[PDB]
Design a protein around this ligand. Sequence first.
Ligand SMILES: *[C@@H](C(=O)O)[C@H](O)C(=O)N[C@@H](CC(C)C)C(=O)NCCCCNC(N)=[NH2+]
Length: 212
Amino acid sequence: IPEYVDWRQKGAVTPVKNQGSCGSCWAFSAVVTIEGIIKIRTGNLNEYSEQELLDCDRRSYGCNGGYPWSALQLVAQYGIHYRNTYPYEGVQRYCRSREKGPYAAKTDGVRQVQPYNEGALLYSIANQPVSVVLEAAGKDFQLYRGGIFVGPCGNKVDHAVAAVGYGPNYILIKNSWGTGWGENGYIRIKRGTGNSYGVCGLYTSSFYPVKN
Ligand SMILES: *[C@@H](C(=O)O)[C@H](O)C(=O)N[C@@H](CC(C)C)C(=O)NCCCCNC(N)=[NH2+]
């Protein structure tokens, strides 16, 4: 795999979103990987509905949090609507997939990256955007304004984001806190520290959709 991967340069990343007050990071995370893999497989970049995952993933808890892997299973089992048809409301409502006609996209499945393994994560990111989790509760993460982030942070992972690239000394992360946070909405997190958790627990739990 190359020394640098940046899926934004391959036109595989949609603009940065702001999840707002709702704890829907897991659905934003999931959607980034769906948007990425649909572009990689079909050549079209589209935006898909975080709101639909929020309303329709019964394993998750709406704005109270959820599971990227569960949302990814939803999309493989059923599909997902365009974001324009099922726009983000920042509040869990009832699942409106049937009202909004046929799904715009469907995946074939969900894989887990083998946890606590930096090379396994980078291999996956070389192929497509990957849903990853990290500890975002710490003030240093929240006030991040740019640079390679090394922490301080612990391993109490609480926030699902999407890795859309990496370099020699960082993993490139699309966050869902708007374009004002971090590096236009992105964070570069240090890798290769020999901490198998990853910094801020980045290697704890990573998933990507499969599409054939
Ligand atoms: C993340 C966010 O929106 O910033 C959001 O709180 C979230 O989805 N958190 C996850 C943990 C990460 C995905 C590692 C989470 O807390 N998942 C468990 C479900 C939420 C707690 N359960 C209930 N019933 N409230």
